[PDB]
């Protein structure tokens, strides 16, 4: 079989790296009339890839002709899937011809192709680089029309460009992304913000005076902790690196930030996505089990993750934090109601039920209404997260929340849920075990009706390292 023959022919061409032959045999298939396929044509992109840039001489075949070879796949209407996005995106980043990169995006659209955010990149970036403004913000416009949502790389790289290109307004509604998507901002994103609010163009930027009422009225229409409606104040910014004490106020200028609330609408949304997502992947039978039996259990003030209370910071599963925290979290609960426990049915009768009153206690919790044992196979994650979003009630894990499964959930909703819901532990030799609460305060960016600016950077743990935040207020 011909197209099965050039299938096995460009897998071995090349695990070598032979991008010559790749291209000959390209070339052989189109003179014998067979026809690429969706596979053919991806390994083809991707071994393309392979090729450098020649810092000497004139462009290479292997690169340049890989942006032919991704123009005919599309020309042909073979269906791009997951692989053409990331080898077309190599083969752009490799070359490093922005408005090549930007092409090949172009003729994605042309043909009804939704382009990745991995694909607007090279584009993107390499305009950047070039400092050339105009151009990266033809790139995001083209990303906002495509309905394709930056992440901070993307953002920071409009932000610089912007600094370098004196565009305030850029600056300005850049920063208002970073709020409204990234929330807490890397370390050089912080030191480029930093850099911003000290500069001649920053210092030089706003108004002296300003419709009070409107600036009132946007701050309601937002949701709270940012009003959008441009630079306010005159002159020199005094910009600190600070902190905020328990209560959200700031340590340099003793401003108190804001909690800004979740909208329920937004939370329901969430949690019928949650279930959804939950019986894809979960046994559906048992995901509805739990359902069932969580609609006739409660009323919850927490839910405890069991296993990661059993094992944060233990050589093995401790009964003793485990109990610890639901003993600690019902005296906690206004009206002493036990903690939802989510534990392993293996776990409920393996090593945690390893001495009779421990067994005993579980089995009490269990008859208390206050604990589920998932079934073998379950990944407890989707049982204990669904509970304390249906319960709308505190979930007490130390579980990082961010990776695998995790990443399924999003980054705009589910981490401000995270941080109005999560309690996490923390253990001193002191003291014993402690509940850490949600802050009174949303850590977020937050632009106050005068005109200032308090900016958290993002970190691991923010119970082991303290965050530091940016205060930049007008001088006068
Ligand atoms: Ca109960
Ligand atoms: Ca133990
Ligand atoms: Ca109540
Ligand atoms: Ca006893
Ligand atoms: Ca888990
Ligand atoms: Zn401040």
Same mark, same amino acid.
């Given at each position: 079989?011909?197209?099965?023959?050039?299938?096995?022919?460009?897998?071995?061409?090349?695990?070598?790296?032979?991008?010559?032959?790749?291209?000959?045999?390209?070339?052989? $298939?189109?003179?014998?009339?067979?026809?690429?396929?969706?596979?053919?044509?991806?390994?083809? /992109?991707?071994?393309?890839? /392979?090729?450098? &840039?020649?810092?000497?001489?004139?462009?290479?075949?292997?690169?340049?002709? =890989?942006?032919?070879?991704?123009?005919?796949?599309?020309?042909?209407?073979?269906?791009?899937?997951?692989?053409?996005?990331? @080898?077309?995106?190599?083969?752009?980043?490799?070359?490093?011809?922005? #408005?090549?990169?930007?092409?090949?995006?172009?003729?994605?659209?042309?043909? =009804?192709?939704?382009?990745?955010?991995?694909?607007?990149?090279?584009?993107?970036?390499?305009?950047?680089?070039?400092?050339? &403004?105009?151009?990266?913000?033809?790139?995001?416009?083209?990303?906002?029309?495509?309905?394709?949502?930056?992440?901070?790389?993307?953002?920071?790289?409009?932000?610089?460009?912007?600094?370098?290109?004196?565009? &305030?307004?850029?600056?300005?509604?850049?920063?208002?992304?970073?709020?409204?998507?990234?929330?807490?901002?890397?370390?050089?994103?912080?030191?480029?913000?930093?850099?911003?609010?000290?500069?001649?163009?920053?210092?030089?930027? =706003?108004?002296?005076?300003?419709?009070?009422?409107?600036?009132?009225?946007?701050?309601?229409?937002?949701?709270?902790?940012?009003?959008?409606?441009?630079?306010?104040?005159?002159?020199?910014?005094?910009?600190?690196?600070? #902190?905020?004490?328990?209560? =959200?106020?700031?340590?340099?200028?003793?401003?108190?930030?804001?909690?800004?609330?979740?909208?329920?609408?937004?939370?329901?949304?969430?949690?019928?996505?949650?279930?959804?997502?939950?019986?894809?992947? #979960?046994?559906? $039978? @048992?995901? @509805?089990?739990?359902?069932?039996?969580?609609?006739?259990?409660?009323?919850?003030?927490?839910?405890?993750?069991?296993?990661?209370?059993?094992?944060?910071?233990?050589?093995?599963?401790?009964?003793?934090?485990?109990?610890?925290?639901?003993?600690?979290?019902?005296?906690?609960?206004?009206?002493?109601?036990?903690?939802?426990?989510?534990?392993?049915?293996?776990?409920?009768?393996?090593?945690?039920?390893?001495?009779?009153?421990?067994?005993?206690?579980?089995?009490?919790?269990?008859? $208390?209404?206050?604990?589920?044992?998932?079934?073998?196979?379950? @990944?407890?994650?989707?049982?204990?997260?669904?509970?304390?979003?249906?319960?709308?009630?505190?979930?007490?894990?130390?579980?990082?929340?961010?990776?695998?499964?995790?990443?399924?959930?999003?980054?705009?909703?589910?981490?401000?849920?995270?941080?109005?819901?999560?309690?996490?532990?923390?253990?001193?030799?002191?003291?014993?075990?402690? /509940?850490?609460?949600?802050?009174?305060?949303?850590?977020?960016?937050?632009?106050?009706?005068?005109?200032?600016?308090?900016?958290?950077?993002?970190?691991?743990?923010?119970?082991?390292?303290?965050?530091?935040?940016?205060?930049?207020?007008?001088?006068?």
């Amino acid at each position: 079989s011909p197209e099965a023959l050039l299938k096995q022919k460009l897998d071995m061409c090349s695990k070598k790296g032979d991008v010559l032959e790749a291209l000959r045999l390209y070339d052989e $298939a189109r003179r014998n009339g067979v026809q690429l396929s969706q596979y053919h044509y991806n390994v083809l /992109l991707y071994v393309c890839s /392979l090729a450098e &840039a020649a810092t000497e001489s004139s462009p290479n075949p292997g690169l340049s002709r =890989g942006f032919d070879i991704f123009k005919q796949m599309i020309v042909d209407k073979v269906v791009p899937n997951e692989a053409t996005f990331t @080898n077309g995106a190599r083969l752009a980043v490799a070359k490093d011809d922005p #408005e090549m990169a930007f092409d090949m995006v172009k003729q994605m659209k042309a043909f =009804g192709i939704q382009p990745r955010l991995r694909s607007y990149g090279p584009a993107l970036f390499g305009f950047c680089r070039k400092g050339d &403004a105009d151009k990266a913000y033809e790139v995001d416009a083209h990303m906002v029309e495509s309905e394709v949502v930056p992440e901070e790389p993307e953002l920071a790289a409009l932000l610089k460009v912007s600094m370098d290109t004196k565009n &305030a307004d850029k600056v300005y509604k850049t920063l208002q992304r970073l709020r409204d998507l990234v929330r807490q901002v890397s370390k050089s994103t912080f030191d480029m913000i930093e850099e911003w609010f000290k500069s001649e163009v920053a210092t030089k930027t =706003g108004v002296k005076k300003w419709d009070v009422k409107k600036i009132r009225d946007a701050v309601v229409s937002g949701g709270g902790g940012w009003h959008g409606q441009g630079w306010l104040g005159t002159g020199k910014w005094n910009v600190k690196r600070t #902190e905020m004490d328990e209560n =959200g106020v700031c340590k340099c200028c003793k401003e108190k930030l804001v909690c800004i609330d979740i909208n329920p609408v937004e939370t329901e949304t969430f949690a019928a996505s949650l279930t959804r997502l939950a019986c894809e992947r #979960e046994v559906k $039978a @048992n995901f @509805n089990q739990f359902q069932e039996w969580l609609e006739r259990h409660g009323p919850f003030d927490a839910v405890i993750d069991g296993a990661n209370m059993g094992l944060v910071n233990q050589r093995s599963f401790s009964f003793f934090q485990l109990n610890n925290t639901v003993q600690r979290c019902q005296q906690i609960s206004p009206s002493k109601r036990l903690p939802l426990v989510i534990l392993h049915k293996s776990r409920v009768n393996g090593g945690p039920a390893t001495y009779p009153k421990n067994r005993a206690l579980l089995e009490k919790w269990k008859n $208390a209404g206050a604990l589920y044992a998932t079934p073998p196979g379950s @990944n407890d994650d989707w049982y204990w997260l669904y509970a304390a979003v249906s319960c709308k009630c505190l979930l007490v894990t130390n579980d990082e929340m961010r990776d695998h499964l995790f990443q399924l959930l999003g980054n705009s909703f589910f981490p401000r849920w995270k941080e109005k819901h999560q309690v996490r532990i923390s253990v001193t030799r002191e003291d014993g075990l402690k /509940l850490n609460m949600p802050p009174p305060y949303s850590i977020v960016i937050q632009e106050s009706e005068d005109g200032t600016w308090h900016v958290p950077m993002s970190v691991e743990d923010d119970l082991q390292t303290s965050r530091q935040w940016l205060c930049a207020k007008r001088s006068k």
